[PDB]
Amino acid sequence: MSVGFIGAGQLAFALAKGFTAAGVLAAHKIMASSPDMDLATVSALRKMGVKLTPHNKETVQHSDVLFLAVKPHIIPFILDEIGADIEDRHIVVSCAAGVTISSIEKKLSAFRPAPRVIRCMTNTPVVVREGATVYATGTHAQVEDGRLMEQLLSSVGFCTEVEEDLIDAVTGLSGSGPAYAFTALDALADGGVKMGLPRRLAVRLGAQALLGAAKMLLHSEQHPGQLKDNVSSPGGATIHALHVLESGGFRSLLINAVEASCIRTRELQSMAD
Amino acid sequence: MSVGFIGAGQLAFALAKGFTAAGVLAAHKIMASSPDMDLATVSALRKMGVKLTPHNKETVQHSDVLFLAVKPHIIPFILDEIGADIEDRHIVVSCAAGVTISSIEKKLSAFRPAPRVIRCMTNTPVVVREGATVYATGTHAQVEDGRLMEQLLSSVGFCTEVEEDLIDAVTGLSGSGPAYAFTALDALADGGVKMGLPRRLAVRLGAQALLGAAKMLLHSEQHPGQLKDNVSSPGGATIHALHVLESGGFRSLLINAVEASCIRTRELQSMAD
Amino acid sequence: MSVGFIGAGQLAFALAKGFTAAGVLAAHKIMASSPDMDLATVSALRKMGVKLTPHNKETVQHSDVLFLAVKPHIIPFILDEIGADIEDRHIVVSCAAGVTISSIEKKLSAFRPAPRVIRCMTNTPVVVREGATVYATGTHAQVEDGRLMEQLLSSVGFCTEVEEDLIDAVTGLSGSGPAYAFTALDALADGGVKMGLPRRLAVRLGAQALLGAAKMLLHSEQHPGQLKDNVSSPGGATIHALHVLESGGFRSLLINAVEASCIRTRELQSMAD
Amino acid sequence: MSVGFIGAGQLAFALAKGFTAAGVLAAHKIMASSPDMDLATVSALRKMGVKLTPHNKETVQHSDVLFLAVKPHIIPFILDEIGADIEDRHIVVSCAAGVTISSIEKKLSAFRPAPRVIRCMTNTPVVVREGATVYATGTHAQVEDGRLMEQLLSSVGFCTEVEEDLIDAVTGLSGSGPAYAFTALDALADGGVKMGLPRRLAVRLGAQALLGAAKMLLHSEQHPGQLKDNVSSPGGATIHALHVLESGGFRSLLINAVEASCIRTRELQSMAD
Amino acid sequence: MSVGFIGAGQLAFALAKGFTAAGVLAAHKIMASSPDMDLATVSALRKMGVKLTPHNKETVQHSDVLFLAVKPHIIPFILDEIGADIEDRHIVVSCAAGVTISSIEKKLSAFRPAPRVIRCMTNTPVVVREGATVYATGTHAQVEDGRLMEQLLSSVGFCTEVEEDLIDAVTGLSGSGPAYAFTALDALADGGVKMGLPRRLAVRLGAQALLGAAKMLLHSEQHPGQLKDNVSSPGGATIHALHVLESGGFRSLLINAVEASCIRTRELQSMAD
Ligand SMILES: O=C(Cn1cncn1)c1ccc(F)cc1F
Ligand SMILES: O=C(Cn1cncn1)c1ccc(F)cc1F
Ligand SMILES: O=C(Cn1cncn1)c1ccc(F)cc1F
Numbered sequence A, B, C, D, E: 001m002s003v004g005f006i007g008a009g010q011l012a013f014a015l016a017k018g019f020t021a022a023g024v025l026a027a028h029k030i031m032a033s034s035p036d037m038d039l040a041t042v043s044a045l046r047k048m049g050v051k052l053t054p055h056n057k058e059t060v061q062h063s064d065v066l067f068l069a070v071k072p073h074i075i076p077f078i079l080d081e082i083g084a085d086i087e088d089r090h091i092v093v094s095c096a097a098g099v100t101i102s103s104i105e106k107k108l109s110a111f112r113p114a115p116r117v118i119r120c121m122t123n124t125p126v127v128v129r130e131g132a133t134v135y136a137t138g139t140h141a142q143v144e145d146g147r148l149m150e151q152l153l154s155s156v157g158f159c160t161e162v163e164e165d166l167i168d169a170v171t172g173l174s175g176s177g178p179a180y181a182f183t184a185l186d187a188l189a190d191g192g193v194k195m196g197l198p199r200r201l202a203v204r205l206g207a208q209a210l211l212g213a214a215k216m217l218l219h220s221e222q223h224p225g226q227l228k229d230n231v232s233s234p235g236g237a238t239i240h241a242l243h244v245l246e247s248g249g250f251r252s253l254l255i256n257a258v259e260a261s262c263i264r265t266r267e268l269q270s271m272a273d
């Protein structure tokens, strides 16, 4: 099985690194073409053994599974460029926000009538094989196409099927989620430094605290509120800190963030019309 | 090497589960005595093979390494109860906030002159072997005692030695940290639900997002701000969500929390003497 | 088998109504004396059959269990007035904030050496037999005295024993709690009226909603957050409303309230000495 | 009579539990079909004796009173699926927000001319027989149909008839109300824990406080402000706590919540039209 | 003229790099000893040719001008270690916050009566020869010592003499100032990314904008408000952005920052006394 990447190099690098680290694909079975790929990600992909080309048509001819990371305003040009090169064997997997299955199918059907299209919402931690991925299957995706995509993406993290109309919300939650965590870890480290810890220790402790808490929740049958209750002793340090989070509307800020990212993806889709 | 637990069952259970899951000690070499241990954690330890007793003296007589989970207002009672039973072989490991090495050494020295005391600041994700632990060695701790402590606690997560005067700050960061994460995950899931995701899926995706981001930072040489920059495309969904976090002072809330937990631990110390 | 009330008439009426409605005491076995009892509560107690007198000594002479609802600045005068009338049979149950067991015992011990004293923290819903009561037993309270008080106060609601140093926190939670609820219900009814409901229906629906939710939590083994999750469909009306509560720091206000009431009771105590 | 449920399993479970606990319906006279019903509620309904089927037509053929819990975007498909199976005996009771009597009558009249339709706004505490329910009768509902639905729904809580144009406001008040209460009870318990109470005791006391206060208001002829006045002594703990609620705009947050839930139900209705 | 550094490596590295880049000192005439110097700065100083040693006495014996970067809680230990090695030729230049000239002179006078002490407040941009430095001369500093110090520190940025009681305020302004700018540049770049710029370009443009504006102010006889007026056309883009800065209290935040840093330096001094 050959895999190709067209579009944003950040997507190509993350999944190629995860796939090769998982051992589910040899690097020479991966080809990538990009217009925005920087020297760092170009050099990193070459050193991995990934094939690189400036020609999107070459990526299509190489690939069985073709990942697209192409924004809605560029989709008409790319699909017109490669549409005639899509074959019966191809599964086209689109990863950019605001690009609907319907838009891709309509554009590709101008060339061949039953394009196999899947939409993917994944995130950067696939690079350490702890991604969160959902996918939705298109009109002509065979049932084995969804199973194949789930097997591939489960090698680099959590993966499950959803209806397409949930992808905007997933984007606001686990797509953008890692950036919320990086912000939180920077701030928690600032807090540790304010209270006297060296920066490097503060970053390590905060990141380990977040990793361990998330793993506890994933391996627990308990509600996150129950785990919060279990850790906070009466009159203790943690419940005092939880009060100051509540006084700042901490919960509402995170709700605001998921909502804002989700709505922005809907706006990006409306700009494709 | 026998290990004993005296005091709060939430501490005892997490470490006993972690230690036994790590395979570094057999469950029958662990004994615990607790007054606040609930029926569920009572039944869970029995099914693991951990020995249980209502008599703290029996735990002391069984143990070589003795973990204490005793608040500062109870420390005078516990140390006077077991002080005459401390032997040369014992390493006393105190885990409660606000209890200084000096206080423990002074109370135990009324019975035997050179008690071996270590202070531990750990957190509940040791239960899934992803804890964050620091320890400080007391006046009479042998150099091999600290090495032993580090080997044992590294089996259930990150562990490093610190000066005792950093433990308050660690408490505000990685001690209370998991509760901040549980709060954040509850709110992120609420955000996913508001935007149309089923609750169970929203919890899974948010927890996976946090776990993966934390793992990325731990395995990266990059600043958390650089990893954040990598997530956000220009004009995209993520940067729109980061703006609304910033507008609410998200970073400052997390700094406030670390500070509040740290300061409260200092207040708990001021109430012991 | 006789019960007396000295002090605030609101306490006397609430417990007398509850006790007689529970059928555990006949109204004529109850005597009350008060300086602040208004004509409405005077007329209501008389119609119940409760004995009324202006002389606190008569209440003491009639009663076996003697409830005091007397603030700290009046306690020296009341205990000096009735102290010589306290007999071996008396159990003195103090209900006012800031009046410690130690203070009552010290004043009464000037007359007879071993006064049987209990502190009670109850609330006004005892009038509908759904109170929340805790009690702490004094130095000379017999073990059967605590059992007797739990049996009596369980007839008008929940009742359990606590250490005296938790009474301030209970006051902030269930003592003041009903006033938080009355405030919330007035506001929820205002919201129903704003959205088009008649006031009387809005008050009925809001009160039934709060009653039913509280009963659900009392009969559930689940965390309140899990029950909250069960109310909201994704994208639905409830989760939209929960967001606007969170944006205003709703949770933090309720924490602020418990804290403020608890701290005020400590201040009322510091003004007695 | 036989009762059927189509749609959201959370609705089916709540009412089936309440009805069977009230003894007004035998579990085997209830049939439910759902696409979102989870394993926990599947096993719970199975264990109760409720019949389960994947076929909505079977539920219709089984039922006399047919509860629908179907969102506006799914209503056209469901009513087209079961419309030909609606008989003269059926009373169709719709429970989802944004689904009007008019929409159901128009869709069902395509099959049979005078469908008997009632709209129901109920809440989760029917599971403990303390729900708050209102209903509105449709064009062809016989006078005994409203009487029957009030008798049935009164077995699980408060029930009264309203005009349909009040259902949106009831949703914001008593429909979403229990979630406001669960949020409040979690926060009140956090406050109790901050001030030194064990979590389990804090949850019990806060829930009992809210239950008792709600019962007082339901059994009182007095304004909630008058009951609030009765709880607060001058200079006392409660009035200090009420001030901090007021300083945060507590009342306005609850008004905001009722309004936000009500308006969201109107938005959900506009997506049906 | 040999120069030595004792203490924090961040201070030593910046000044050593600046001095060597300015050509006023050969790298082999510089010696540094540090306990917190990391591997990256160890290798960087070695590659420059700076001499490194773990022994502070060797640094003193090598040096004519001796820079100290030692916190007030460590100053007693350092001055006790090297005090006997101070010779008449030495100028001791202290750079740490909260360490007064008087404190240094008092500790060093225990060994030799007339120590030449200068206090320095500098910042990290000395590494690109654009530092901001002030100094105050001690009791026994010869007049040529101040001129020598100003000549040395003027090679790496702005340098002027001040009274010692201004150094805490300078610390809050130009000492901490670069960190305010780094924060501002990160945020400005986030704003550029939100509006569609690539992150690398956004950082470059924002940093160039700040550099150029600062240079304009330094080379103008004009008030910063006049320069502000000159940039803003009526109804234009800039004045619209200035309004949103004003609406958030932007100016007051920067005043808050200078004040907070200045006050913290005073607190660090009082913990030494
Ligand atoms: O780059 C994208 C999406 N994208 C496509 N064109 C512009 N943006 C992306 C990268 C990494 C990842 F894990 C997930 C993603 F969606
Ligand atoms: O319970 C404590 C400390 N404690 C002792 N007495 C009261 N509190 C604790 C529990 C789990 C954990 F991972 C870390 C801890 F410090
Ligand atoms: O009036 C009091 C306490 N009090 C005594 N003197 C001033 N205040 C009271 C009333 C009803 C109730 F249910 C609980 C109470 F604590």
Ligand SMILES: O=C(Cn1cncn1)c1ccc(F)cc1F
Pocket (backbone or CB within 6 Å): C233, D007, D008, D010, D011, D014, D068, D069, D070, D071, D095, D096, D097, D122, D123, D124, D125
């Ligand atoms: O689930 C619903 C309504 N619904 C139907 N389709 C989507 N939502 C519901 C559940 C329990 C309850 F008590 C009241 C309700 F309206």
Ligand SMILES: O=C(Cn1cncn1)c1ccc(F)cc1F
Pocket (backbone or CB within 6 Å): E007, E008, E010, E011, E012, E014, E068, E069, E070, E071, E095, E096, E097, E122, E123, E124, E125
């Ligand atoms: O590190 C310090 C001061 N310091 C000394 N011990 C702890 N802190 C410092 C570093 C670089 C700089 F440019 C200016 C400085 F003051």
